[PDB]
């Protein structure tokens, strides 16, 4: 039979599923489609370790996505002295250990501020590492957009949350 | 172009 859909958490307004690298090709192809949509909205032109989490609405539409990947370290984002008479941020030079890199996170614009992103990050923390629940100090975000920095600081409850650029 | 900011040491 056709493989089962991997539901992580379920809610009144949808469910969070996850696509893993070893899943069927139609699933991996759906994950690719969603990543292309997200990169396009971020303004980017164009493997065996990323997991794609999707928030699926009750109408069976993917209205949220979070692409997660293993990492080993990340860096605290720091405050920059403002210029007196007026986009790059500076991070700590001391790396801190981290487990899960949030490479992309996206919610359909008309459904933002409904805790879809927060619940997706909860689902990642609960399912990324078998038998464990990751703390907010074990996750990091890649080069956040302004939206992402506002989300991440609220979610992790600190201004200096963990950041990384990309796993090469 | 891209909406992601740059983050440096
Ligand atoms: C690279 O990709 C990095 C991984 S960063 C990429 C961030 N994604 C984008 O920039 C794409 C477009 N923006 C989005 O998809 C969404 O804005 C997010 C995914 C960033 C947030 O999704 P969501 O809207 O579902 O977040 P929550 O409801 O879970 O918010 C929880 C708390 O986060 C704070 N906050 C969130 N979003 C904020 C925005 N635009 N502005 C200011 N503050 C924002 C809030 O404190 C929010 O709690 P509330 O009770 O709603 O206040």
Author numbering:
A (entry chain A): 521 to 566, 572 to 611, 621 to 702
B (entry chain E): 103 to 111
Task: Provide passages from the article that reported this PDB entry.
Cohesin is loaded onto chromatin by the Scc2-Scc4 loader complex, however persistent cohesion cannot be established without the acetylation of two conserved tandem lysines on the Smc3 subunit by the Eco1 acetyltransferase (ACT). Eco1 is an acetyltransferase that belongs to the Gcn5-related N-acetyltransferase (GNAT) family. The xEco2 ACT fold is divided into two domains: the N-terminal domain contains α helix 1 and 2, and β strand 1–5 with a conserved central β hairpin insertion between β4 and β5 that is unique to cohesin ACTs; the C-terminal domain contains α helix 3, and β strand 6 and 7. The binding site for CoA is sandwiched between the N- and C-terminal domains involving β5 and α3, while the substrate peptides binds mainly to the central β hairpin and the C-terminal domain including the conserved C-terminal extension (C extension).
The substrate peptide adopts an extended β conformation different from K105-CoA binding but is accommodated by a conserved surface groove created by the same structural elements on xEco2 including the C-terminal loop of α1, the loop connecting β6 to α3, and the central β hairpin. Instead of the C extension, the binding of the K106 substrate peptide to xEco2 is mediated by main chain-side chain interactions through the formation of a parallel β sheet with the second strand of the central β hairpin. The side chain of the K106-CoA conjugate protrudes from a central CoA-binding cavity gated by the conserved L562 and F564 residues, whose hydrophobic side chains also contact the methylene groups of K105 at position -1 (P − 1) and the methyl group of A104 at P − 2. At P + 1 from the acetylated lysine, the acidic side chain of D107 forms a salt bridge with the indole side chain of W623 on the central β hairpin. The structure rationalizes the propensity of Eco1 substrates to have an aliphatic residue at P − 1 and P − 2, and an acidic/polar residue at P + 1 flanking the target lysine in our substrate motif consensus. The binding of the K106-CoA peptide is accompanied by an outward tilt of the central β hairpin from its peptide-free conformation with W623 displaced from a central hydrophobic pocket by Y109 of the K106 peptide.
